[PDB]
Structure formats: structure tokens, C-alpha cells
Amino acid sequence: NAAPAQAPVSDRAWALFRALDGKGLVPDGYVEGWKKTFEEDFSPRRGAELVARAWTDPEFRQLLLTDGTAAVAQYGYLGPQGEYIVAVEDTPTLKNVIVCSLCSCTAWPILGLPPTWYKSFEYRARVVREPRKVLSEMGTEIASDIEIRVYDTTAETRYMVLPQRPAGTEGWSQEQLQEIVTKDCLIGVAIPQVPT
Amino acid sequence: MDGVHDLAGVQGFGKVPHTVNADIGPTFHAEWEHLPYSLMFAGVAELGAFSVDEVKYVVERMEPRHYMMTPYYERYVIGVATLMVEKGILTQDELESLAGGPFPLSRPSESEGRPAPVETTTFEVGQRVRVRDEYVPGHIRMPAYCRGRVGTISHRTTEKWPFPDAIGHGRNDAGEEPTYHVKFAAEELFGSDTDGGSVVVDLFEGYLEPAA
Ligand SMILES: [Fe+3]
Ligand SMILES: [Mg+2]
Ligand SMILES: [Mg+2]
Ligand SMILES: [Mg+2]
């Protein structure tokens, strides 16, 4: 049951790059462009913008919940791993949570690349079977009158959670509301928090 | 493929390594970590050498012990490297020479895959479906927890995509199918041994049949 012998991962990854690049197969600036997209463009700030708009614009909310792709496209936020979007609505009796049990699939352009924990074996194995306990352990208590619904991202649909809007935010601006919609709110493991 | 990657429902893992809203650090935690995805896209979009589905499958093909001890982004380094060798673009010799040491790859496939199903049904929202009780040794986008189980349609996609079990093996006969959001009661999947409500799995048409 021992691990196989391996060169350091950094050496292996750059060997793969260099093998391909030295054959002319990687355009100039290609991987650096993707790094920039992944770091700067794909971002949960975008999903937060979308949530805030939904919270303050009933018509947009309806659109987001019925044709998430169209709603996202209005903002220009479709992209790789985010071409067919479904938003799922939390309600006073329903909490939604997203996973990719098979790997890591995530709505990259609007949530950002997944965090390490989302890709963990612990999350992948457990949240589909014991989501209430997982969320509890992570710091989110879901009252016992709420059905938890776990969306397993097994095909091309890419999900975002539309959380309930908390009390104490009435009249906030879109900017103020965006600030409290975090990455974890979009994944579904957190509920938006309003400061004291 | 009933591999160790099919983790949903496995028992014995500990805590998820996160508390909500904790700092996750930068997008990439080492200077190579953007390479796997970038080079996957080179392969898919620039070379035309493989599909994303083939990347999912080649990661499933890691030797099981190897899969279990390998960090996420490293699995995709291994997987993309493997595809580049299988497709005749690179050699393992040159990878190992450049790396300065061993670069073990995923294992060879032991299935040629299967075509998009000839006979399938267009389902409607509210309809009850069963996941076909089938075993596929190659790639499939059906987690085993739902095989043979009953649920109801919550959405039919308005787009269609190649059948994974074909395109994940680079076959020519993946066709196109919509997928369905199938909602299962927690108890349908895990009996009494769950604390959840429902699970929605996004299932290709060809994995489904009408319920009884
Ligand atoms: Fe995934
Ligand atoms: Mg209000
Ligand atoms: Mg299994
Ligand atoms: Mg199992």
C-alpha cells in the first residue's frame, strides 16, 4: 500500500508545461492569461452582485430563477464551467447546498474556482448523506423546520444558491448587500450575516 | 466506473477542513497550480486533443491508492500528462527527463466506453423516473448512490451535450442528450442513515427510464 516514487510535484507540473511549450503547442502568454482569468475575473463577487440584484429587483429575481443563463449573460458573466446556469432559491422551509461528489465541478465565473475544502474527500463524501451535520460542524445551524436539498453537480448544469435575504438589511444599497453575500453563501454552506 | 472517486455516501471521513467564511487564502497556493487547468484548456481548445470528459475519466483512472493520497491539483497534472502520452503528443520518457525523476501516470482504461443509448425517453417536469440499474466500467456521470433509485424530474435542460460514457473515451458516437435534475428523497438513497431532505442529481437522459 505504499505511495509510488514521484519527483516533486512542482517539477512534474513544470515538466508538463515545458514538454508542451517546447513543441510549440502552447501559445505565447497562454497559461499566464488563464492564471489571470482564474485569479482576477472568476470571482464570487460576481455571484454576490447577482444575488443583490435579485434581492432588490423582483423582475430580475424571477429571471434568475427561471433562466439563470440569461440572467447571468446580462452581466456578461457566462464563461468556462459556467455556461448553463441554474440558481436555486432558499426559502423559509428549504436550504440548498451544492457539491461535486465526483470531482469539483463549480460555477467558476460567478463563484470563483472552488476552495480546497469543497474539493476535499470529507465534503464530497459527507454532504450528500449528512448535510445538516456537515453544515453544523462548519458553523451553520439549520433549524430543524428547514428541508436541506443537496445539488450534486454531475453534468453541465452549474449552480448558485440564492440565499434568503436577512432581516436588518431593509433599504440597503446593492453594494451594501453584495458585501454580505460571501463565497460560502453562494455554495450554500453559509447564510448571509448582518453585523450587530 | 465504480472507482474510489465515487465518494458520495462513504462513511468514516472526519470534519470538512473549513469553518464558514474562513480565509481560504489565494486562488493558487503554489506557483504551478494554475498549470493543470490551463494545460487542460490547451489540450481541449488549442490542440483539440481531448475533451473535458476525458480529463474527468483519466483522473478516475489513477491507481486507487495513488488517487487517495494525491492533492487535487496534482491529480490533474497527472491526468493531463497521461492524456498527452496516450494521445501520442508527449512521451513518458520526456516527462520524466524534464521532471528529473518519476512521473507515474494514470492506469490504462479497461473499457472502450459505450455509445449514446439508442432508445431513451423525453421526460417532463414532475414525472417519476428510475436510474437505470446498469454497470458501466468506463466513464459515467452517475454516482452509484443513485443507481436503481427513484426520483422526480425537477428540470429538463434546454441544451444538450455529448453522452459522457462515449466522449469520455474519445469515441465518435456520443450524440447529444439533455440532462435532468432528478430529485431523490434522502431516505430513498440512504434509508434511515441520513440527516438530509433531498438530493438532486443532474442525470443524462440515457441514465434514466420511466419509473415502474
Ligand atoms: Fe467536479
Ligand atoms: Mg424585504
Ligand atoms: Mg462505489
Ligand atoms: Mg461506497
DSSP line for A124-149: HHHTTT-HHHHHHHHT----TTSEEE
Chain A residues in contact with B80 (beta carbon < 8 A): 16
Reported as half-sphere exposure (CB side, CA atoms, 13 A), residue B124 has a value of 2
Q: Do B88 and B3 belong together in one domain?
A: yes
* Facing B13 at nearest CB: one of A4, A31, A125: A125
Experimental determination approach used: X-ray
Domains, chain A, with CATH or none: 1-196 (3.90.330.10)
Domain co-membership, B140 together with B83 = no
Instruction: Say if residue B4 is in the same domain as residue B90.
Output: yes
- A23 C-alpha vs ligand 1 centroid, how far in Å? 30
Looking at the fold, whether B117 and B212 belong to one and the same domain comes out as yes
Distance of CA A34 to the CA centre of its chain: 18
A104 annotated as ligand-binding: yes
Q: Do B195 and A132 touch (CB under 8 A)?
A: yes
Nearest CA in chain B to A151: B200
Q: Under DSSP, is residue A104 helix (H, G, I), strand (E, B) or coil?
A: coil
Tell me, yes or no, whether B172 and B101 share the same domain: no
Look up the CATH number of the domain holding residue B45. Answer: 1.10.472.20
Please name the amino acid found at residue B48. G
Here the CATH number for the domain that contains residue B203 is: 2.30.30.50
Are B106 and B150 found together in one domain?
no
* Side-chain-side CA neighbours of residue A106 (13 Å): 25
**A102 Cβ under 8 Å from any chain B Cβ:** yes
Distances in whole angstroms, Cα of residue A82 to Cα of each of A42, A73, B177: 10, 10, 18
Minimum CA–CA partner of B204 in chain A: A155
Domain containing B64: what range? 1-110
Element (H, E) at A28: none
Q: Do B115 and B187 reside in the same domain of the chain?
A: yes
Apex A92 CA angle, A89 and A98, nearest 5: 40
Of B5, B34, B199, the CB nearest to A152: B199
| Contact present, A44 and A182 (Cβ < 8 Å) | yes
Residue B122 Rama label (left phi>0; alpha psi -120 to 50; beta) = beta
From the list B27, B39, B141, which residue is nearest A113 (CB)? B27
Q: Is A126 on the interface with B (CB under 8 A)?
A: yes
Distance CA B149, CA B115 (A): 23
Angle between helices A58-66 and A68-75 (to 10 degrees): 120
Using alpha carbons, select from B120, B108, B205 the residue that is nearest to residue B163. B205
Nearest CA in chain B to A20: B90
Q: How many domains does chain B have?
A: 2
Residues B102 and B7 in one domain: yes
Q: Enumerate residues with CB within 5 Å of ligand 4 (an ion).
A: B 10
Looking at the fold, whether B185 and B201 belong to one and the same domain comes out as yes
Please tell me whether residues B103 and B117 are part of one structural domain: no
Decide which of B110, B142, B166 is a domain's last residue: B110
Residues of chain B contacting A85 with CB distance shorter than 8 Å = none
Resolution in angstroms comes to 1.2
**Contacts with B9 from chain A: Cβ below 8 Å:** 125, 128-129
Q: Are residues B8 and B55 in the same domain?
A: yes
A36 Cβ under 8 Å from any chain B Cβ: no
Based on the domain organization, do B143 and B90 belong to the same domain? no
Which residues make beta-bridge pairs with A148? A95
